[PDB]
């Protein structure tokens, strides 16, 4: 599977960290599309079975738009950061 950078959880935008904490609490989430399956159609994340991955909005004050920033979870609690609606991913390192 392809090359993903690591990013320390503490180095993520405040809002990204907020999303990680909401995910850990099982919501309630701010958007209706929070928690929808991410199908990983570009194989940017490790290839897994159907429904392995889910996506959550990372709030962008930037406008009134929902925006492009996302966390994607895996089935065993993997966490990935994507600022750009899945064009790119980094693996979130829960240790730093």
């Amino acid at each position: 599977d392809p090359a993903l950078a690591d990013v320390c959880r503490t180095k993520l935008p405040s809002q990204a960290q907020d999303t990680l904490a909401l995910i850990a609490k099982n919501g309630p989430y701010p958007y209706n599309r929070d928690g929808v399956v991410f199908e990983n159609r570009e194989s940017r994340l490790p290839k897994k079975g159907n429904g392995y991955y889910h996506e959550f909005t990372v709030v962008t004050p930037g406008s009134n738009d929902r925006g492009t920033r996302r966390v994607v979870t895996g089935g065993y609690g993997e966490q990935y950061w994507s600022p750009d609606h899945y064009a790119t991913f980094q693996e979130i390192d829960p240790r730093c």
Side-chain angles (χ1 to χ4, degrees):
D1 292 298
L4 298 183
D6 297 305
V7 62
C8 284
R9 190 268 300 169
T10 65
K11 293 302 206 293
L12 294 165
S14 70
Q15 303 85 4
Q17 299 184 58
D18 291 338
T19 301
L20 296 177
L22 263 186
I23 293 170
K25 288 172 173 299
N26 187 29
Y29 299 106
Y31 302 96
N32 298 102
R33 277 189 63 87
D34 286 342
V36 175
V37 173
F38 171 66
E39 284 185 328
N40 188 34
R41 286 277 184 164
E42 332 304 320
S43 317
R44 288 179 188 137
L45 300 181
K47 288 186 217 356
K48 302 289 179 179
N50 285 17
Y52 192 88
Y53 295 109
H54 305 258
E55 63 73 33
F56 304 86
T57 314
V58 173
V59 170
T60 300
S63 91
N64 334 76
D65 203 317
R66 176 152 175 245
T68 64
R69 313 150 107 186
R70 299 287 185 280
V71 167
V72 171
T73 62
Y76 287 103
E78 300 92 330
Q79 301 193 298
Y80 303 92
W81 162 239
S82 180
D84 52 17
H85 200 264
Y86 322 126
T88 89
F89 292 101
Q90 303 174 124
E91 196 149 18
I92 308 169
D93 187 340
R95 306 171 296 168
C96 55

